[PDB]
Symmetry: D2
Subunit: 485 residues, 4 copies
Amino acid sequence: MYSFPNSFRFGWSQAGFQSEMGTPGSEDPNTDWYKWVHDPENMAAGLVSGDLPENGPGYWGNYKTFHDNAQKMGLKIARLNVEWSRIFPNPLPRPFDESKQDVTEVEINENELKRLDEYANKDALNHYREIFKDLKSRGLYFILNMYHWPLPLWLHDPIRVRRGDFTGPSGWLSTRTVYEFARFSAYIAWKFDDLVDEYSTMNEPNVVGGLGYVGVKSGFPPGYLSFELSRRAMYNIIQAHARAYDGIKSVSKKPVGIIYANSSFQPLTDKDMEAVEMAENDNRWWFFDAIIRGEITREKIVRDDLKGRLDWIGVNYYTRTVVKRTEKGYVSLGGYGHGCERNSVSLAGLPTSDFGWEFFPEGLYDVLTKYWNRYHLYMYVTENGIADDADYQRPYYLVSHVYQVHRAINSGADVRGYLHWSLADNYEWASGFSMRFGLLKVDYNTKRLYWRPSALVYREIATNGAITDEIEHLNSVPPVKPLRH
Amino acid sequence: MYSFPNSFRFGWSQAGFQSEMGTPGSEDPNTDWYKWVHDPENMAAGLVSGDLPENGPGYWGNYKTFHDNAQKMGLKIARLNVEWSRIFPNPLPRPFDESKQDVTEVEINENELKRLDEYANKDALNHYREIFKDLKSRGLYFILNMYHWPLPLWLHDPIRVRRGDFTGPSGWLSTRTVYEFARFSAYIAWKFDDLVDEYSTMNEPNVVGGLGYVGVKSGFPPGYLSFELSRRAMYNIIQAHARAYDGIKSVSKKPVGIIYANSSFQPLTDKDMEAVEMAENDNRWWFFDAIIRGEITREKIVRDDLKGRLDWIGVNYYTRTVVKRTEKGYVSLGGYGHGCERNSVSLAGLPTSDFGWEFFPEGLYDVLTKYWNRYHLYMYVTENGIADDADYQRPYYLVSHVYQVHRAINSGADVRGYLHWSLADNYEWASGFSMRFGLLKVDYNTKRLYWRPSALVYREIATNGAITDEIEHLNSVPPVKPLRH
Amino acid sequence: MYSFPNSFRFGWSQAGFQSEMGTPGSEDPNTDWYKWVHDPENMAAGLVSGDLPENGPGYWGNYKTFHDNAQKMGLKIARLNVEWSRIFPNPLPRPFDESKQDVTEVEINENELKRLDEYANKDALNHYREIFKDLKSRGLYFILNMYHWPLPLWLHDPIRVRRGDFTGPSGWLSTRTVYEFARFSAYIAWKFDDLVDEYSTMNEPNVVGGLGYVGVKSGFPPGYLSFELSRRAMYNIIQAHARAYDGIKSVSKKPVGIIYANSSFQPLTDKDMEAVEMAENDNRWWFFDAIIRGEITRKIVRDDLKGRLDWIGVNYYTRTVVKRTEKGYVSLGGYGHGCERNSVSLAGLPTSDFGWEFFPEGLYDVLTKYWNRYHLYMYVTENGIADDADYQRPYYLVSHVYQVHRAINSGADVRGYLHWSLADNYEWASGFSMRFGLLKVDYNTKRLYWRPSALVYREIATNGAITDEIEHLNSVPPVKPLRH
Amino acid sequence: MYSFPNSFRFGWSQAGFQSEMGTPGSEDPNTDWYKWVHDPENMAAGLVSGDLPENGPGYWGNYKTFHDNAQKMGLKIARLNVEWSRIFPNPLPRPFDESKQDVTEVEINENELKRLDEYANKDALNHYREIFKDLKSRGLYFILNMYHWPLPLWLHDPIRVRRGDFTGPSGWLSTRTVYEFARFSAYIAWKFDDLVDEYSTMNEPNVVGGLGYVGVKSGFPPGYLSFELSRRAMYNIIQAHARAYDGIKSVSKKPVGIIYANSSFQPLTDKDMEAVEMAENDNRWWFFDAIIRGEITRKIVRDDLKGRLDWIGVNYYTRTVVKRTEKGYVSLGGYGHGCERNSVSLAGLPTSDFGWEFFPEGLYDVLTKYWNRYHLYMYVTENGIADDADYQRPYYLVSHVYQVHRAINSGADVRGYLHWSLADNYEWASGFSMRFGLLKVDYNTKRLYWRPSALVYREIATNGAITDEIEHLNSVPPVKPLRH
Ligand SMILES: OC[C@H]1N/C(=N\O)[C@H](O)[C@@H](O)[C@H]1O
Ligand SMILES: OC[C@H]1N/C(=N\O)[C@H](O)[C@@H](O)[C@H]1O
Ligand SMILES: OC[C@H]1N/C(=N\O)[C@H](O)[C@@H](O)[C@H]1O
Ligand SMILES: OC[C@H]1N/C(=N\O)[C@H](O)[C@@H](O)[C@H]1O
């Protein structure tokens, strides 16, 4: 048996855009992501799958059923977001010098919050209250995240930007978005603080800027290929996180963290340890050193307005990245980690998921302990999961990763929960519905939810607060012989 | 949901030779099967795997744990056998004309039973009582089967017979074995009737004679290739069943049936329906017409001593057989049913097990309804299961077959239980330990039992007496795309 | 036996950018494609493989060896191109109103050619002459193609355009490229007509416009996603074809054709035949009806477009399966070029190292459809398979050659079969990993090796037939031993 | 380039029972093997495939075509056998005490040969003469083998023996077979010495005894499982070899050898070298030490066994991996001949249609070990692969031929390489599905087709070398595109 602390919580994470739509009356056409996935040119190019979010699992209407199953499964924590676009579907009054690079302060007071309240959609606000009240009534501790990728269209027209036209609303390329996100986050905290246990500002900002402006084959908006603009978006999102932290703290005493996309960097050969360190710098430390230590590049400076804006770290983990040394520095290798063939085996002989992601649970131990040792901030594992409609690998994937969290705690790391991605299948961005990450399988025709055998396994874990002796054998690699190569 | 009658029982089947040994003090070296699997020439030839039963899951010593898990899983029925060899390890007094073809009667009375009792091993008898009492204490209804393949060595030296020497104990080739089996069965019923709910005489006699004397590549004892001797063994086993039925009835009022190896015969093309009928005659009806209607070939005769010796039919089902018409009659086709490649796909694109057996749950409906329509005797599904260490396919296999039993009942067939093969992994005959059929995985080093996710699924079924709405999606074919081709 | 007419020739096709570089001294940095595959951002995005064409098979230096092997293989025809960038690496003085949509005429004469002559790189001109003379000396009939995708950088800066900046050299989006292309083509014919047997203006203009401005995941320059700009590019390249035809004919009496990317459109179900016809309209007929019948949409007849084609080069690899929809028709993934690599299609047919389905019947379909609509003679200017191991190529080669025999048998005038390609080469955005050669290239030494399919092709070419002994290869590669 | 000595010959091997039947008039029902594969019980058991050799490739009728193709392929050597059953289909009068264990001498002279002559089938004798003369006329050096597994039914009724009945004709279990074999072999040399270049007494006697009486799942006659009878069979066949050697030498001065089944024994870990040596003793040295040095266990020296060998025929397909145990050593499944069909071994190496691992290094190992122990010259009398598709064969062929070049380079006297086989044939208990031919056979028409490997072998044989152009095929077939 592997037993967890009495205060440790098992649960799940979910995003608004991916799960909300699907039931009558739930449609939210007012984001960049919505327009992006409906775009005829994006469709013809194959940048997006052609599946549409309004045909989704319908959490907007069916949230009670989701919660009923989560309670039956013994879950005790949930992390969800509000969609910015549903609360402010129309523009707010121009407030502030758009040409200044830095946003060091955003003043928000009771009077400004009351003005904002005049513009907010009240049906959306009341619906979210009805969702969150139900959530809390099933004994789920609630982490509220402010942002999980889609921006209101009045803040970002991604097609115009894809086209190389920067005269319109330009998303994370504009400090206006930074200013409005701060106000939005303070506002949400102001409205929902009675229901919330902890806050996250953002989900995976590094993915927003990285796939948006560099990894353009991923079909993430605005899909404009530019190193320079990727840096500018990342700079703005960092200061937005900081301003949102101050904003929430102005109305709440509760903890405020951030959720980030992690990979475990692994050396190809024993001569590649430095390459790993450089990769960890370039992908992880530079970001967290900005929002914790205020250290940033603009020249290399310390900003007092950035320093100390973080109470906890949300660790999103799926797989590793294998790196090797170069003359220039380091490179990541194809055929390991997230760059494998789908339903196959990596160059290391480890099985890959429906998404082509390599099975590597040890990497979670690596990531949790590395964060712990650098910053000594407590963490939650805010995402971990696998694309697997058949449920062949998921029982092993779940048990193995949960075990590595037990290992991290054992070594001294403060980790207070594990939240699987996800409770149910949902709309996987540019890939559409084909990538199924749910403990529960969704029939998209009826919206019925089904317990995959992994869900029964998770229920064993959660109800016992332990990997029990009876399922401990799942702490292993799925046998590769009967799977596709 | 698919709900079963309130009186319907879900459970499991297990064989003594396959599961008993493994714990200190459990060794039974006194069968033909034991000698067969230890034989140096059989090993060198690869007729047997080289694995040995004395390294097995240890039900002899660990039965309480097996039963504890079966109770936790909500099971309510079990079918097990006594090993003849453990009760009578030494020969009994010659009793009876060995040259007579037919055995129409075997007189057994109280006095003869008391004499037999002088020769029986009392430690073995008391141990089996301790096993069965525990079984009954977990609320399991008990089907006691008399015979599941291994014969005492004093009745069969399979190596001598393999060598073409018929001067020694010749197993089912001798009417002495028929006479002794009758006495053995009456004796066991006489000793255990207070603990038993229903009786089976034999498990799969058609396999004993078919693999023993025709399908010699299977490495079943005595492995002597002879159409003529296969017919003689089958003739003797039929009359043995009949004499055992009379013997048990002499001491018990309880129901007495038999368990038989079934395949669903399927036509290659729509012009092959007659081929199916001929296959059903040659593999199924000829046998059951003998022991129910007394009809047999010796010339084609009716034996009053055979007629009506059957209260119920145990249906063992794994997969189909595809047949086509010939000039001579019919032939079965490779690449379907049990003749596929391991961990692959059949010629019909259906996934195959670790044993190379094709996924075909519809065949169970075929078999149950065919039996029902011919004889109108109630049945139990006494075996159904899959070789699958990884547990990839078993969740689908279990749910799908259980569904087909619901279908058969719905159509009017009297089916009173479903017994999975098996509760735990065990020694799979000539194949050894590599073929794992358990709901529970066995670690053969420690003898610890582990719940595969299919076991959690079975528990849902059994505790609810239904395929619940939540697991109903498993009533489908395992997706082939992520599995080996 | 399947015997071809005595005049039928077997040979091969190759492209300058794909095969020329690799030997020191061969480097041509002056194209949009060179810049495109060296671009840091494109590399980081994975739009290009990171492989570089200067590490190629080195036809520039080693052409004599290529030709030696082709002769040993019994080949009697070759289609190659000159690279525009090599001949005119520096910008030409502006000549002509750039805002006019149509380019109906480009005046070229002796004096204008002599002027152009003074900008041309003479080292490049003499080298091509040396390559083509050696070609001719090995008995190879010569189809000279003017254009196989790279443009001089002075006509197209693809990174600027990718970035959404239209103030620079804009490639096929500008009538200046049309004008200069007409002049380039007249100029090359003027210099090389003594060596050339037939001309092609261009290779697969449909792919240039289609992957350049719509299929942007393919990493083709300039990778600017726009239906409107895709139409404009195609409009320009059509008129460039016509002006190039007139330009060549002003200096030569030899046949002038075009090489085009074809797929065989096949119905998913028997209820999808109309979808096939719509697909053929949208992908094939619209284009050829423009340059043959002058019919275009801008729906009019342009007399400067009409009749500008003597022959049709058919490039064929695989099929495309289509179904009817409400709005029209869609192509289906899991068939044709949209399959998993080294696997099988949704129909159970084997796929190549590139994920393309084995479907040789499609070639018969494409040849006979063209023949029945236009009655212009054809060459199969490309057909081949990405297959480093050589597992499928023997079957692929014999099966497709058989379909050409079928086409001829049914009445179609097909005059040659040119395999893609003689040796491995640089496969555009995919780099070197896609190996189409009858000959394998060791890129470290530039040595060529005969894959067994080359021995099989020698049998066909030397005999002018699929011989009795290799006739079994007219079948699908057995899928059981291959990856699924 | 890898050039062979000028005297080195490339060719092929084939067996009478596997290749002769198929043409009407060729049927030979008089062997144990014929009876064995027609047996109803064996068929029902799956011990034999159900395929029948009378539906074969038809070398009996079509030998001229086989030879025509072999000549076109540049082959200069052939090893075949006469079928005993064809020459003596009826029982010979009993001659000699059958209960004596040793057969140290068999007296054969002119008069005894003339007597035998009166029992011989003359139609069969003349037909073989016609086949061998046509062979010789195509420039093929001729190795005549006396025995390649089938015995006349009058010497072995395999079904009787399978059933455990030892009162009938018992094949290699009886010294009568030894006696008659010596006489048969002297007789054939007597009739055919004018046509023959070198002799082999027998093909793979280790397999006859080993699969016949131990590996009974292989479906080899008589399939009676007995360690003791396996030893007795092997003892008899050894002395039959020796008596056959003396018999041939009484009528001929030509070289007399033996063809044997080899595997290259390889250690699982570096701690398994002793296991390899024990494996080589138990599978190879014990046998050759008997017929070369007269050393045998009955542990003595037999002067009638000593020195009865001029040359060694090495049959090689794959390796066997072994490990040390307490009791000795064991062979490991997942390597060598014990792999899954059309997949990869535990070492990641591709396997054939028969499940045999690609391991050409083993041939170098086997050739040099023999050479170093005995210093007798060798021929590679079999090497090939079950591969209907021809995916692996080009690599298999070139790689193994290279290892022969390696062996010669290191000093071993190897004089030829004979591929198994020229055309597909009847693969014993497996039937026709295992196709080893350089030429594919259509069994419906008996037509032969050149797989691309045949074109590759023509390159090797005609040049007497692995040429520069095919040298890349000296490598492992890429596993990525193949089934796993
Ligand atoms: O891929 C599954 C999830 N993975 C994620 N990060 O890796 C995203 O936060 C989430 O929205 C889903 O995309
Ligand atoms: O193959 C699994 C089981 N199958 C059986 N019949 O098919 C036997 O009764 C049982 O003992 C096990 O062999
Ligand atoms: O893909 C192989 C070839 N195929 C082509 N068209 O499909 C191009 O003309 C040629 O340049 C190569 O890309
Ligand atoms: O397996 C291919 C050949 N291999 C053989 N030995 O391994 C036999 O000599 C020959 O008759 C064929 O069986």
